[PDB]
């Protein structure tokens, strides 16, 4: 997919007014200035990136 890029990490999340999630994506090989907020449907090929973010929520760093 031409718009499917490798994720370094998800580093934040938020809820929209529909109760759906958006994720703050750090893109592999890009700098912080290139981070984006992505709707959850964009993370369908990143289930591990979500599970890893969720695990890191429970740890210190």
């Amino acid at each position: 997919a031409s718009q499917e890029f490798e994720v370094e990490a998800i580093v934040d999340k938020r809820q929209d007014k529909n109760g759906n999630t958006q994720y703050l994506v750090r893109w592999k090989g890009y700098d912080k200035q290139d981070d984006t907020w992505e709707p959850e449907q964009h993370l369908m090929n990143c289930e591990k990136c979500v599970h890893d973010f969720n695990r890191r929520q429970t740890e210190k760093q």
Partner: peptide
């Protein structure tokens, strides 16, 4: 590429 973990990026 370091992993198979990809997501659609918003332009």
């Amino acid at each position: 590429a370091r992993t198979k973990q990809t997501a659609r990026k918003s332009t």
